[PDB]
Design a protein around this ligand. Sequence first.
Ligand code: NI
Length: 88
Amino acid sequence: VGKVKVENILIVGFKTVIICEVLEGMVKVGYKVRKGKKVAGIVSMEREHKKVEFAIPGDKIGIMLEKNIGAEKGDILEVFIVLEHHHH
Ligand code: NI
């Protein structure tokens, strides 16, 4: 299971941003992040303050979620893959 480590929570005007380090696996817009019994989807991601689609172990990213899940500095959050049946 993918994992990210929370470094900080930012409040940027109308946005709540989780700054985290990718520890394991791939992390992609559309995947879910879980803390305890709270799960939310990733709506958007930034790396180096530039909008990105996915991130890999070693990346420091900012993520915005569909809803807040109580993320705090030091939390190791699990990342759930969400299948995208595009019918290619
Ligand atoms: Ni892509």
